[PDB]
C-alpha cells in the first residue's frame, strides 16, 4: 500500500449514546408548568433525515422520562408552596347527612377567638376526604389528621397542562424514529435528527391516556415482552374515543377565618338537585376502537381469547379511572367500558389527593364555584394481564390498569433518542507534514 | 436528469457515506457543533470545557484553525493494513472510528510525545542557530 500518515480531522459526524438534560421550551406567554423561565420555541424548526445511517431505539431506556418526572414534581411543589395549612381544621366534625350520602353537612367550634374573628362556620365536606370516628356518632375528621399536615392549594394556581417542548443542548442531538411500525425497540431504519421536540402536555391520569398522540393509521400495541406478566401493554389508538365529562352540581363556596390574617375556603351550599358526576362516552367510537385492538391482540394472544372484563386490582384510585377535569379530581368506574367481554360512567369526586404519591405534605383542592364541563378523547390506554392461566386460548383478561404515572410521558417519548456527538477524529493520508 | 438538494448536508447524514464524500461538509458539521437558570448555567460551563478541550489538543498538535491537518506521525499498519483507497473510498466515518477505536489514545499520545516534543525542541534550536 501507500505509505500512510496520520491526519487529524475535525467535524467528524459520529456519535455515541449519552444521557443529559434537555432545555425546556414553551410558547411563551401561576400555572404549574407555565414557568417564568423557559426558552421560546422555534417558529421554523428543522428536521433532516440521515438515511445512510440507522439507529437502535429502545423506549424503555429513554431517561428523559426521569427528567420530566422530577422537574414536574418540583414545579408543582414550588407553585403551591405558600399555601394554607389545614392543621387547625383537624377539629372533629359533627356531621349529618346532607338532604337531597356522599356529602355531609357538619359543624365544629375552632379557633374560638384565638386573637381573631372566627366562628363555628358549618360547611359541606366530602366522604372521600374524611375518616369516620367509629367511637363517636359516627363523627368525622380530616383523613390527614393521623398522617401529615396538608395544605389547601393556592386559588391563584391553574392546573391546565402546558405543551412544553424540549430541545438539545450544545454538543448533543435528538434522533427520532419515524418507522410507523416501531414498537418497544429495534434498529429503526427511518431515523432523522430533530432540533427540538414538539410539546407534550403533562396530562395525569390512570387506566386511559387522554389528549395524546394517535397511532400511524392502525392501532399499535407495544410491550417489553408480551409473554411476561410483570410487564404492561401500551395501546396507541388509531383514532380517539370521544368523552364528555360534567359536574352538574352548581356549587358555591365560602371563605372562613381560621386565624389572624388567615383564610380557608369551604364548600358552600349547592344550587339545584345534587347529582352524580359522570362522563358520557360514545359507544360507537369505543366499540369500534376495541374491534381494532382485539384484532391486533389476536396476533400475540390467540384468535378466540376472551378479553376485557370489569375493573379490578389496586386501591380505589387504581381501580377507578382518574382525571382532573376543571381542577377537581374525578374517579370514575371504567367498568362500564369493560362490562362486557369479547356509555355513562358513574363517578365520585375527591379533594385530598396525592400527586402520583405524596409523603407527608399533600394537596387539598379548593372548592370550585359553579359547574365543571370539559371535553377530551381517549388516545391510548394501558392493559394489564390478570396472571397465570391455562395455556389454551380461552381467556386473557386485559383489565385496565397502571399506576406508574411515568408511563404518561414515556408513551410519547418512545419516538426520541439523545446522543453525544464527537467531532474529533483521525484517519490515514498519503503524505508527511512538511516539517522543518 | 438529476434532482438536487438545496445547498449542503443538513446534519450528520454523511456519517454513513464514505469518509471521502463526507469530508466535503466538515466545515458545515464543525460550525454546527461548535456553536432552570442554574441547570442551564451548568450546561453552559460544560459546553465551554468541551469546546476548549478540543481546542487545546488542536493547538498542541499544530492543527488549530484547520479542520484537516497532516501530522508527521507514520501510520503503523498493525492498526489497519488497508490501503488509502480501501479506507477512504470504501468506509464510513462511523465504521472507521470503530475499527481503530482502541488506538485513539495511542496515536494521540504519539502525536504529542513524539512530534510536538520534536517540533518544540527543534524550533528553539533553529531560532537560536
Amino acid at each position, epitope marked *: 500500500a501507500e505509505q500512510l500518515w496520520v491526519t487529524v480531522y475535525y467535524g467528524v459526524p459520529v456519535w455515541k449514546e449519552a444521557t443529559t438534560t434537555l432545555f425546556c421550551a414553551s410558547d411563551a406567554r401561576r400555572n404549574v408548568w407555565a414557568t417564568h423561565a423557559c426558552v421560546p420555541t422555534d417558529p421554523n424548526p428543522q428536521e433532516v433525515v440521515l438515511e445512510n445511517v440507522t439507529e437502535n431505539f429502545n423506549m424503555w431506556k429513554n431517561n428523559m422520562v426521569e427528567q420530566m418526572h422530577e422537574d414536574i414534581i418540583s414545579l408543582w411543589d414550588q407553585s403551591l408552596k405558600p399555601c394554607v395549612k389545614l392543621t387547625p381544621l383537624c377539629v372533629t366534625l359533627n356531621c349529618t347527612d346532607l338532604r337531597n350520602g356522599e356529602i355531609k353537612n357538619c359543624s365544629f367550634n375552632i379557633t374560638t377567638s384565638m386573637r381573631d374573628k372566627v366562628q363555628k362556620e358549618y360547611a359541606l365536606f366530602y366522604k372521600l376526604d374524611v375518616v369516620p370516628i367509629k367511637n363517636d356518632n359516627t363523627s368525622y375528621r380530616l383523613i390527614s389528621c393521623n398522617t401529615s399536615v396538608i395544605t389547601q392549594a393556592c386559588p391563584k394556581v391553574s392546573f391546565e397542562p402546558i405543551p412544553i417542548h424540549y430541545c438539545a443542548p450544545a454538543g448533543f442531538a435528538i434522533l427520532k424514529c419515524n418507522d410507523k411500525k416501531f414498537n418497544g425497540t429495534g434498529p429503526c431504519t427511518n431515523v432523522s435528527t430533530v432540533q427540538c421536540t414538539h410539546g407534550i402536555r403533562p396530562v395525569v391520569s390512570t387506566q386511559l391516556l387522554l389528549n395524546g398522540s394517535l397511532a400511524e393509521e392502525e392501532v399499535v400495541i407495544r410491550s417489553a415482552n408480551f409473554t411476561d406478566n410483570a410487564k404492561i401493554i401500551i395501546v396507541q389508538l388509531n383514532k380517539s374515543v370521544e368523552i364528555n365529562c360534567t359536574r352538574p352540581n352548581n356549587n358555591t363556596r365560602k371563605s372562613i377565618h381560621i386565624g389572624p390574617g388567615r383564610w380557608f375556603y369551604t364548600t358552600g351550599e349547592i344550587i339545584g338537585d345534587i347529582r352524580q358526576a359522570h362522563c358520557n362516552i360514545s359507544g360507537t367510537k369505543w366499540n369500534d376502537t376495541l374491534k381494532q385492538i382485539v384484532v391486533k391482540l389476536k396476533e400475540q394472544f390467540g384468535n378466540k381469547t376472551i378479553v376485557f372484563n370489569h375493573s379490578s386490582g389496586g386501591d380505589p384510585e387504581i381501580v377507578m379511572h382518574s382525571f382532573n377535569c376543571g381542577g377537581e379530581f374525578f374517579y370514575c368506574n371504567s367498568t362500564q367500558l369493560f362490562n362486557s367481554t369479547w356509555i355513562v360512567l358513574p363517578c365520585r369526586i375527591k379533594q385530598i389527593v396525592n400527586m402520583w404519591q405524596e409523603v407527608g405534605k399533600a394537596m387539598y383542592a379548593p372548592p370550585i364555584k359553579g359547574q365543571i364541563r370539559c371535553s377530551s378523547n381517549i388516545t391510548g390506554l394501558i392493559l394489564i394481564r390478570d396472571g397465570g392461566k391455562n395455556r389454551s386460548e380461552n381467556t386473557e383478561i386485559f383489565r385496565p390498569g397502571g399506576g406508574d404515572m411515568r408511563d404518561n410521558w414515556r408513551s410519547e417519548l418512545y419516538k426520541y433518542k439523545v446522543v453525544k456527538i464527537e467531532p474529533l477524529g483521525i484517519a490515514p493520508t498519503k503524505c508527511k507534514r512538511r516539517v522543518v | *436528469a438529476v434532482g438536487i438538494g438545496a445547498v449542503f448536508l443538513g446534519f450528520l447524514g454523511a456519517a454513513g457515506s464514505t469518509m471521502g464524500a463526507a469530508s466535503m461538509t466538515l466545515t458545515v458539521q464543525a460550525r454546527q457543533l461548535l456553536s432552570w437558570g442554574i441547570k442551564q448555567l451548568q450546561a453552559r460551563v460544560l459546553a465551554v470545557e468541551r469546546y476548549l478541550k478540543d481546542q487545546q489538543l488542536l493547538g498542541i498538535w499544530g492543527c488549530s484553525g484547520k479542520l484537516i491537518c497532516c501530522t508527521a506521525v507514520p501510520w503503523n499498519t498493525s492498526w489497519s493494513n488497508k490501503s488509502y483507497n480501501q479506507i477512504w473510498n470504501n468506509m464510513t466515518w462511523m465504521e472507521w472510528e470503530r475499527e481503530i477505536d482502541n488506538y485513539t489514545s495511542l496515536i494521540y499520545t504519539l502525536i504529542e510525545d513524539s512530534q510536538n516534543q520534536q517540533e518544540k525542541n527543534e524550533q528553539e534550536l533553529l531560532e537560536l542557530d
Partner: antibody
Amino acid sequence: QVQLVESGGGVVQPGGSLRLSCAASGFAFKDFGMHWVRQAPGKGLEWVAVIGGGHGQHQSYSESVKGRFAITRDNEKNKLYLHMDRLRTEDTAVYYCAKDRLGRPWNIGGRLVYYYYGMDVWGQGTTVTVSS
Amino acid sequence: AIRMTQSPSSLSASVGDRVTITCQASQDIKKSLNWYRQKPGKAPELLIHDASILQTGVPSAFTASGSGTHFSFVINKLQPEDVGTYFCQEYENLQFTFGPGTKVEIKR
C-alpha cells in the same frame, strides 16, 4: 424474481379520488428511485412523476399532473403509491409503476442529488377510468 | 426536457428488410436517449439506452446511433415478432418526455 403487482384501480367519477399501490419484490425497492407513467387509450406513453430512492427526498411532476397527484413510498411494505385526487376525465389511462436505472442519492458537492437515467423495470399497470 | 419528434408515424416493410426510425430533438440533448418497444398488451420494452447500448438480455437485432439533435433506431431485420411501437424518450431533464412513437408493422 422481480415482479411488480400493480392494483388499486377501477372506475371513479370526475371530482373523486383513489390511490394506486404497486407492490414489488426481487430488488432493493428501498434503494432505487421509481417512476410513474401513464398511457391513455389511443395515445403514447406520458411520463407522470419521479421519486428518488431512500426516503424520497426529491420529486418532479409533469405539468399535466402537478397539483393534482402526489407520489409517496413505504420502504417496509415495498409499495409505491400514487395519490390520484380531484380527478378529471382527461386522467383516464393505464398507470404503470417503474424503477429507474439508478435513482440513487449520491453525496456529491456536499449535497445529495438523485441521478436518473430512465425507467428500465416495470409491471403491466392497471386501468383507472374517470367518467360519468 | 426537449420535445422529441419521430417520423414516419407509420413505418412498414416486408419480413427481413432493414427498417429505420428517424427521431430528432429541437435542441441538443447530447446523448440522453432511450429506445422502447411496445407490443399489444405489454408495457414498452427497453431495447437501447444512452442512444446506442443494448439492454442486458436484448439480442443484437437492433442498433441505434446519433448524438446532439439527430438520432435513429435501426431494425437490422424486421420480423413479425418485432412488430410494435418504438418510442424515443429523452431523459436529460426531469420530465423524461416521450416522443410520439412510431408503429412498425409487416406489409400485406
